[PDB]
Structure 1
Amino acid sequence: NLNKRYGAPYVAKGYASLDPRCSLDAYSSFQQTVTSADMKKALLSIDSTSSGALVIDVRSEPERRLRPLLSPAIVALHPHDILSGAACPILPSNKERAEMFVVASEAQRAVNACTALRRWGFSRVTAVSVDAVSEAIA
């Protein structure tokens, strides 16, 4: 005689609180764009004397050797350290005010890593540009 002791958020609960909707919104941010100004605002977040790297690149370790972008001290996270939740101890506190970015080799991984973020309670990230952040050297 459950749901009398436990709530309705029992038995009628799709304990899959992971990704019924976020994955979609991940493919939404994939669609719009990211460009210079979308990095230039992040440049101001690098211009902010408080240095916490904004964008992160989820790319294989041989890839980054080929096009090194590590210049502004941005964070290089293996895409599982994001998915698995091992990266939350280094992730902004303001889940609703922060928007980092996610660079990736091919834009499928980026959105596939940014959906992991939005599963971790993060709200804004437009989630890709492998080539812009190099054209925005900063």
Structure 2
Amino acid sequence: NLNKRYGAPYVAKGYASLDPRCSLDAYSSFQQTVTSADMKKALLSIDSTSSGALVIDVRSEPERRLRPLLSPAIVALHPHDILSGAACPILPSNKERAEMFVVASEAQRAVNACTALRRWGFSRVTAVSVDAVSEAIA
């Protein structure tokens, strides 16, 4: 005689609180764009004397050797350290005010890593540009 002791958020609960909707919104941010100004605002977040790297690149370790972008001290996270939740101890506190970015080799991984973020309670990230952040050297 459950749901009398436990709530309705029992038995009628799709304990899959992971990704019924976020994955979609991940493919939404994939669609719009990211460009210079979308990095230039992040440049101001690098211009902010408080240095916490904004964008992160989820790319294989041989890839980054080929096009090194590590210049502004941005964070290089293996895409599982994001998915698995091992990266939350280094992730902004303001889940609703922060928007980092996610660079990736091919834009499928980026959105596939940014959906992991939005599963971790993060709200804004437009989630890709492998080539812009190099054209925005900063």
The TM-score bracket by the shorter chain reads over 0.9
Q: CA deviation at 1:134?
A: 0.0
Q: CA deviation at 1:88?
A: 0.0
In structure 1, distance between residues paired with 2:68 and 2:82: 20
Q: TM-score, normalised by structure 2?
A: 1.00
Q: Structure 1 segments of 4 or more deviating over 2 A?
A: none
In structure 1, distance between residues paired with 2:127 and 2:39: 12
SS at match of 1:113: helix
Q: List runs of 5+ in structure 1 lacking aligned partners.
A: none
Q: Deviations over 1:20-76 (max 9, x none)?
A: 000000000000000000000000000000000000000000000000000000000
In structure 2, distance between residues paired with 1:6 and 1:97: 35
Residue 54 of structure 2 aligns with which residue?
Answer: 54
RMSD: 0.0
Q: List runs of 5+ in structure 2 lacking aligned partners.
A: none
**Aligned runs of 1:65-76 on 2, under 5 Å?**
65-76=65-76
In structure 2, distance between residues paired with 1:114 and 1:21: 13
How many pairs align?
138
Q: Percent identity?
A: 100
Q: TM-score, normalised by structure 1?
A: 1.00
In structure 1, distance between residues paired with 2:119 and 2:63: 26
In structure 2, distance between residues paired with 1:101 and 1:6: 40
SS at match of 2:43: helix
Q: CA deviation at 1:18?
A: 0.0
